Symmetry: C3
Subunit: 32 residues, 3 copies
């Protein structure tokens, strides 16, 4: 169960890093 | 401890999935 | 290993909370 969790958490880290980059780009595209 | 972590990870997966879908839709609306 | 996963999951939770705030703003500006 911990080895499986480690792999799910690594997959989440890679998806969140990306979303952060895509959201940063969208924020620039949309503007203020 | 591991059961509680499994619950937290499943909740994060459900939030990341969605964010991915919302981001995809926003990308289309910006012209990518 | 368990403490290391708890650290990583906490970090992810605070990055996903945010992404949800910034995606909520983008969706409001583009949608309305
Ligand atoms: C949990 O991810 C976990 C628990 C047990 C094992 N392996 C064996 C042989 O029991 C892998 C992973
Ligand atoms: C951690 O989430 C954890 C550790 C032990 C137990 N024990 C039992 C018997 O349920 C639950 C959860
Ligand atoms: C889409 O945004 C999407 C589709 C399915 C799920 N599933 C669950 C269980 O939340 C999340 C998000
Ligand atoms: C897991 O994150 C983990 C496991 C063991 C230890 N330290 C000792 C002394 O057992 C730290 C962290
Ligand atoms: C986001 O949910 C968030 C982040 C920081 C703060 N800070 C204060 C002091 O209210 C509120 C909400």
């Amino acid at each position: 169960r911990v080895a499986r969790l480690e792999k799910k958490v690594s997959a989440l880290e890679k998806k969140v890093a990306x979303l952060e980059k895509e959201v940063a780009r969208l924020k620039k595209l949309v503007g203020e």
